[PDB]
Amino acid sequence: WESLYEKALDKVEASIRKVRGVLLAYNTNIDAIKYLKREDLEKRIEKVGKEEVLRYSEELPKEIETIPQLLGSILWSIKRGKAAELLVVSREVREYMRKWGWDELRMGGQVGIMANLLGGVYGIPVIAHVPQLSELQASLFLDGPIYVPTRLIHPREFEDCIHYIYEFPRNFKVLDFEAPRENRFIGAADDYNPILYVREEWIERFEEIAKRSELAIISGLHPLTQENHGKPIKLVREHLKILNDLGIRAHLEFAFTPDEVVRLEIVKLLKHFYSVGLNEVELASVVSVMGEKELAERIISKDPADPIAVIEGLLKLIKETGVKRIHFHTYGYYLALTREKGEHVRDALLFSALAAATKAMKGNIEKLSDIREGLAVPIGEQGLEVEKILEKEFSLRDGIGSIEDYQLTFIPTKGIGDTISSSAFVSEFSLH
Numbered sequence: 001w002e003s004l005y006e007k008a009l010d011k012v013e014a015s016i017r018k019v020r021g022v023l024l025a026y027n028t029n030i031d032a033i034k035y036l037k038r039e040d041l042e043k044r045i046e047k048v049g050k051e052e053v054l055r056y057s058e059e060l061p062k063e064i065e066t067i068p069q070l071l072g073s074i075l076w077s078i079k080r081g082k083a084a085e086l087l088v089v090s091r092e093v094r095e096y097m098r099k100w101g102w103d104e105l106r107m108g109g110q111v112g113i114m115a116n117l118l119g120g121v122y123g124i125p126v127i128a129h130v131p132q133l134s135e136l137q138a139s140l141f142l143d144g145p146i147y148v149p150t151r152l153i154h155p156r157e158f159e160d161c162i163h164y165i166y167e168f169p170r171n172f173k174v175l176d177f178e179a180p181r182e183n184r185f186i187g188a189a190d191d192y193n194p195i196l197y198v199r200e201e202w203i204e205r206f207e208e209i210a211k212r213s214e215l216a217i218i219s220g221l222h223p224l225t226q227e228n229h230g231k232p233i234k235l236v237r238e239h240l241k242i243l244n245d246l247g248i249r250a251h252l253e254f255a256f257t258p259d260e261v262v263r264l265e266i267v268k269l270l271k272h273f274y275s276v277g278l279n280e281v282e283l284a285s286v287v288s289v290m291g292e293k294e295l296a297e298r299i300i301s302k303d304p305a306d307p308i309a310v311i312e313g314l315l316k317l318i319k320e321t322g323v324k325r326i327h328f329h330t331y332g333y334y335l336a337l338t339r340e341k342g343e344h345v346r347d348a349l350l351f352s353a354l355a356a357a358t359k360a361m362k363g364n365i366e367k368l369s370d371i372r373e374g375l376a377v378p379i380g381e382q383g384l385e386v387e388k389i390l391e392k393e394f395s396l397r398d399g400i401g402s403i404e405d406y407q408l409t410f411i412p413t414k415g416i417g418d419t420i421s422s423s424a425f426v427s428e429f430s431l432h
Contacts, residue, residue, distance in 0.1 A: 001379055001412055008351050009351060012348070012431070016123075016368070019429060021124070021214055021215075022124055022125070022213060024216075025217075025218055027131070027193045027219055027220030028130040029108040029109045029112070029131075029162070030105065030107075030136055030163065031108035031165060032104075032164045033167060035168075038174050041071070041174050045174075056073055057073075057075030060076050060084060062086075066092075067096050070187055073187070077168075079178075079180075085187075085188060087188050089191070094189040097187055111129055111219060112141065115128045115146050117365065119144045121142075122368055123145065127147055127149060128148050128155075131193060134159055137161065138155035149208075150201065163189070164186065164187040164188075168184065195232060196220050196232035203235060206242055210242055210243055214429070217252070217426075218273075222256060224259065225262065229261075233265060240273065249429065251422070252270070252276050253278065253417055253418050254278040256281060256285055260289055267286055267289065267320070270317070270321040273323055274324055276325070277328075277424075278327075283328065284300045284313070299313050304385075304386055307333075308389070315403070327349070332382035332383050332386060333410065334413060334420075334424075338407050340432075346398075346411065347427070348427040351424065351427045357373075359416075387399070396408070
């Protein structure tokens with residue numbers, strides 16, 4: 001496998017920028033990170049009222065309308081050491097948070113994060129959808145062929161949708177509480193992304209914008225609820241159809257969607273996507289909502305994820321959607337089921353696994369050339385064991401086989417899931 005890993009990287013290294021442009025849509029925001037300090041926190045709590053704050057540290061509010069609710073929610077996460085996120089619907093509270101400030105800024109949303117990766121690192125032209133492109137928002141994009149449609153211009157040439165993170169380490173102490181695990185609470189001063197807001201220009205002239213791309217990656221659907229999914233899903237469906245009529249392949253990393261009704265709806269929406277990516281948790285979630293409760297559990301029961309179970313789950317997915325490309329990724333191995341055939345599918349998976357391994361050690365991919373670092377990372381033991389399993393069930397030749405007109409491709413691993421499926425999707429078609 002090591003030789004195939006080297007050859008794959010070498011090819012993608014030279015071919016990835018062949019992609020003429022990638023359309024990235026919907027969710028983009030600003031992440032404002034604050035490393036909490038006990039003195040500062042306790043002082044602010046006393047100012048607003050210790051008793052008030054405490055009540056919310058016991059029962060998380062539905063939303064954050066007042067300062068006590070904000071601080072209490074922070075405490076809620078601390079005393080339990082568990083993540084939680086709530087919308088800040090009060091101007092007053094947003095102003096409070098703005099003044100409170102932050103220690104570091106980071107690009108948020110899959111659109112912004114992939115623009116920086118695909119455009120800022122891989123050198124591929126990116127057309128991004130940014131709900132609110134403020135000066136601060138724009139400053140978070142890296143240099144490179146990163147654009148937004150009105151002619152295409154760089155973000156820097158164009159309100160703040162800020163998510164305040166409030167992070168604390170394990171055993172962080174405040175009042176008489178102690179964090180049982182390193183975590184964070186997020187105050188989202190953003191009422192655009194939660195509803196999958198779409199810029200007016202993208203609603204009115206999507207075809208013209210779409211024509212500047214070769215591939216598309218859609219994200220931001222997971223937070224939609226049964227109450228607000230109506231209009232956005234209809235819009236996304238309209239865009240997908242247009243993309244499909246143009247020959248533009250669209251991809252989606254099926255991020256966990258809490259609302260079960262929306263989850264099922266996005267599953268069916270896949271009939272209009274060319275490609276979908278997901279891990280064991282997301283696959284189990286999807287299979288479960290399709291009624292296959294038995295499979296769902298069996299897909300996440302064993303570790304590594306039971307390969308036979310995963311494939312059966314994947315086959316159920318294709319049966320209901322006809323999705324032409326599926327990229328399954330977990331710790332230990334990746335699997336792809338594609339109507340398109342060839343070793344290029346394997347080249348792409350291998351390249352994406354190297355990207356993941358690189359971001360795993362380095363913690364951040366800054367140059368394409370840095371991916372070569374993943375070459376020296378030994379192949380996982382679990383990876384070889386799963387291969388043994390799949391060679392018993394299928395006639396795999398160097399990780400390649402087939403099933404029901406779909407090519408099956410396996411790869412032993414050494415990437416936020418997004419870095420993985422996006423890198424493989426884009427690299428695969430750069431070779432086409």
